[PDB]
Design a protein around this motif. Structure first.
Motif, PDB file in Angstrom:
ATOM      1  N   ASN B 248      50.348  21.352  24.915  1.00  0.00           N
ATOM      2  CA  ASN B 248      49.989  20.044  24.377  1.00  0.00           C
ATOM      3  C   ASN B 248      48.533  20.025  23.932  1.00  0.00           C
ATOM      4  OD1 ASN B 248      52.569  19.141  24.875  1.00  0.00           O
ATOM      5  ND2 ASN B 248      52.037  17.997  26.733  1.00  0.00           N
ATOM      6  N   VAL B 250      46.538  22.431  23.068  1.00  0.00           N
ATOM      7  CA  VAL B 250      46.278  23.240  21.877  1.00  0.00           C
ATOM      8  C   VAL B 250      46.976  22.698  20.639  1.00  0.00           C
ATOM      9  CG1 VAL B 250      45.856  25.339  23.188  1.00  0.00           C
ATOM     10  CG2 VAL B 250      48.161  24.842  22.366  1.00  0.00           C
ATOM     11  N   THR B 251      47.860  21.706  20.782  1.00  0.00           N
ATOM     12  CA  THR B 251      48.402  21.066  19.585  1.00  0.00           C
ATOM     13  C   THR B 251      47.390  20.164  18.884  1.00  0.00           C
ATOM     14  OG1 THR B 251      49.232  19.061  20.646  1.00  0.00           O
ATOM     15  CG2 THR B 251      50.637  21.033  20.732  1.00  0.00           C
ATOM     16  N   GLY B 252      46.202  19.974  19.456  1.00  0.00           N
ATOM     17  CA  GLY B 252      45.228  19.038  18.930  1.00  0.00           C
ATOM     18  C   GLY B 252      44.219  19.687  18.006  1.00  0.00           C
ATOM     19  N   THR B 253      42.953  19.316  18.171  1.00  0.00           N
ATOM     20  CA  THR B 253      41.890  19.785  17.298  1.00  0.00           C
ATOM     21  C   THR B 253      41.505  21.224  17.632  1.00  0.00           C
ATOM     22  OG1 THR B 253      40.079  19.030  18.722  1.00  0.00           O
ATOM     23  CG2 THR B 253      41.009  17.426  17.169  1.00  0.00           C
ATOM     24  N   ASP B 254      40.783  21.850  16.701  1.00  0.00           N
ATOM     25  CA  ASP B 254      40.306  23.206  16.940  1.00  0.00           C
ATOM     26  C   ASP B 254      39.310  23.249  18.092  1.00  0.00           C
ATOM     27  OD1 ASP B 254      41.907  23.787  14.798  1.00  0.00           O
ATOM     28  OD2 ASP B 254      40.277  24.211  13.394  1.00  0.00           O
ATOM     29  N   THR B 257      41.528  23.312  21.274  1.00  0.00           N
ATOM     30  CA  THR B 257      42.025  24.678  21.390  1.00  0.00           C
ATOM     31  C   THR B 257      40.918  25.616  21.852  1.00  0.00           C
ATOM     32  OG1 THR B 257      43.524  24.164  19.561  1.00  0.00           O
ATOM     33  CG2 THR B 257      43.315  26.480  20.203  1.00  0.00           C
ATOM     34  N   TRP B 286      55.189  29.364  21.915  1.00  0.00           N
ATOM     35  CA  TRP B 286      54.867  28.168  21.138  1.00  0.00           C
ATOM     36  C   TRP B 286      53.380  27.837  21.226  1.00  0.00           C
ATOM     37  CZ3 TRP B 286      53.953  23.446  24.053  1.00  0.00           C
ATOM     38  CH2 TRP B 286      53.637  22.344  23.245  1.00  0.00           C
ATOM     39  N   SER B 289      51.714  30.208  18.949  1.00  0.00           N
ATOM     40  CA  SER B 289      51.856  29.823  17.550  1.00  0.00           C
ATOM     41  C   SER B 289      50.876  28.714  17.194  1.00  0.00           C
ATOM     42  CB  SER B 289      53.290  29.376  17.266  1.00  0.00           C
ATOM     43  OG  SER B 289      53.515  28.062  17.745  1.00  0.00           O
ATOM     44  N   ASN B 290      50.661  27.773  18.115  1.00  0.00           N
ATOM     45  CA  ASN B 290      49.674  26.728  17.863  1.00  0.00           C
ATOM     46  C   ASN B 290      48.256  27.284  17.860  1.00  0.00           C
ATOM     47  OD1 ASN B 290      51.238  24.427  17.403  1.00  0.00           O
ATOM     48  ND2 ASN B 290      51.550  24.097  19.602  1.00  0.00           N
ATOM     49  N   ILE B 291      47.995  28.323  18.655  1.00  0.00           N
ATOM     50  CA  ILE B 291      46.657  28.908  18.676  1.00  0.00           C
ATOM     51  C   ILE B 291      46.396  29.696  17.396  1.00  0.00           C
ATOM     52  CG2 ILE B 291      45.257  30.702  19.764  1.00  0.00           C
ATOM     53  CD1 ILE B 291      46.305  29.658  22.476  1.00  0.00           C
ATOM     54  N   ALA B 293      47.490  29.063  14.600  1.00  0.00           N
ATOM     55  CA  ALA B 293      47.320  28.100  13.522  1.00  0.00           C
ATOM     56  C   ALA B 293      45.900  27.561  13.432  1.00  0.00           C
ATOM     57  CB  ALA B 293      48.298  26.937  13.705  1.00  0.00           C
ATOM     58  N   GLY B 294      44.982  28.066  14.244  1.00  0.00           N
ATOM     59  CA  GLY B 294      43.619  27.588  14.302  1.00  0.00           C
ATOM     60  C   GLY B 294      42.677  28.398  13.438  1.00  0.00           C
TER      61      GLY B 294
END
Lengths: 16, 426
Positions: B248, B250-254, B257, B286, B289-291, B293-294
């Motif tokens: 959750n 890491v789904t947010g801002t850089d 993360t 997952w 994958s979110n990381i 995407a940073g």
């Protein structure tokens, strides 16, 4: 680019 | 004595004007509702007993009847939304909140449990419990110098009820309530009881499942390091909510993360991505994958922790959902990464499992894998190595699958496969 996505019992009966 | 009473006899006893008879009947009702069978909640409700139990909750001169009625109402509220609604409509919320301050520990515990069930019904009853003023006495029950002095079950029930007060969305809990509860949650997150820790991590996961402002509220309390520590735990009931909360976050801002990364979370992922539990594996993939995407420096952090080989591994062998999360992670990597990082990715052997996964039925995984391959071909174009990549994709028998996909029902898959085969395989 960042994609999104509850184990505890929402309710529990008291047996003892 | 009070075993296997009929609801008719329970009603007879409750309707007597003898407080001892009422207490005996209320204990009989509690025992009737405490059986391992599905209790006869509907029969108890139809008899109109909820108002009498709620009234007994206010008899401070007879603590035993308070305890018995609280237990019975807890069990009633543990059922369907309609039965919890019946409990709430009897006026039980303010009575339970008043009983939270009882000098007897077991009565206070039953009040905590009942309020937890009520709040766990949903966001409406959660907000109603908050509006009646339950957070203050609940948190006061935990205003002790050392949590270890509290009974194990008592602290566990308090933590579970607090987690239910942090739970559910549309709407999410009131911001002021979340800010009022967070400090106690951090305190509990530093506790040693595994069940308390599990419930606290679940509460944090609930709070972090939302827009970036909720994530920021959670992160500013400085719990990310403790969350990573618990992520390294051995007990699965702790690792699961800790990993969910980290995902959750890491789904947010850089920047959020980056807080996750600075706490050393990646060092734990070698085992998470190889965890025996497929659910942990999928959640970790997952999060990865979110990381990926940073920012490019975050992709480089992923590379330096040696996690690309583990991504290749999960892409090669894992349950289909985990492999899909891995495909997403690779697509984000290739879209956001430098040609140097993409070359490294290729050198780790991503092409062969990426091709192998193209025989999938899901059209979404197919199109995302095609996007990944397109990004890889662009990276190779900037290097003049496009013929090298062509020979790579053709050596493992992969081009056959792209040719087959040329005739896919999805228009996007159709067009992407056609474009790839027309430009790089003609």
């Amino acid at each position: 680019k960042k994609r999104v996505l509850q184990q505890p019992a929402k309710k529990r009966l008291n047996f003892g | 004595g009070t075993v296997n009473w009929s609801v008719e006899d329970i009603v007879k006893g409750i309707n007597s004007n003898n407080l001892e008879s009422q207490l005996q009947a209320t204990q009989a009702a509690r025992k009737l509702l405490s059986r391992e069978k599905q209790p006869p909640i509907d029969n108890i409700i139809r008899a109109g007993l909820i108002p009498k139990f709620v009234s007994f909750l206010g008899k401070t001169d007879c603590s035993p009847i308070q305890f018995e009625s609280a237990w019975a109402l807890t069990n009633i509220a543990s059922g369907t939304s309609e039965q919890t609604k019946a409990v709430v409509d009897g006026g039980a919320i303010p009575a339970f909140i008043s009983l939270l301050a009882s000098p007897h520990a077991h009565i206070s515990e039953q009040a905590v449990w009942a309020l937890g069930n009520i709040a766990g019904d949903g966001s409406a009853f959660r907000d109603l419990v908050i509006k009646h003023g339950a957070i203050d006495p609940l948190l006061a029950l935990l205003a002790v110098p050392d949590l270890s002095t509290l009974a194990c079950g008592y602290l566990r029930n308090l933590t579970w009820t607090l987690s239910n007060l942090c739970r559910n969305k549309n709407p999410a809990p009131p911001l002021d309530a979340v800010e009022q509860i967070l400090p106690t949650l951090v305190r509990l997150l530093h506790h040693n009881d595994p069940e308390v820790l599990a419930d606290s991590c679940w509460a944090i996961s609930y709070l972090t499942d939302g827009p970036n402002e909720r994530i920021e509220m959670v992160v500013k309390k400085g719990v990310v390091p403790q969350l990573v520590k618990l992520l390294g735990a051995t007990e699965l009931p702790i690792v699961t909510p800790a990993l969910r909360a980290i995902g959750n976050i890491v789904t947010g801002t850089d920047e959020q993360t980056q807080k996750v990364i600075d706490a050393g979370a990646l060092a734990v992922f070698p085992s998470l991505l190889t965890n025996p539990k497929t659910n942990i594996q999928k959640e970790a993939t997952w999060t990865m994958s979110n990381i990926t995407a940073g920012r490019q420096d975050q992709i480089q952090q992923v590379v330096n922790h040696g996690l690309v080989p583990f991504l290749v591994g999960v892409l090669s062998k894992a349950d289909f959902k985990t492999q899909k999360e891995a495909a997403w992670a690779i697509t984000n990597y290739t879209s956001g990464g430098t040609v140097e990082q993409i070359v490294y990715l290729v050198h780790c052997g991503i092409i062969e499992p990426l091709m192998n996964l193209l025989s999938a039925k899901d059209t979404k995984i197919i199109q995302v894998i095609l996007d990944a391959i397109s990004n890889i071909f662009q990276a190779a174009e900037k290097l003049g190595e496009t013929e090298k990549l062509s020979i790579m994709i053709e050596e493992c028998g992969g081009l056959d699958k792209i040719e087959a996909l040329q005739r896919h029902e999805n228009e996007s898959v159709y067009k992407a496969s056609l474009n790839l085969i027309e430009k790089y395989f003609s």
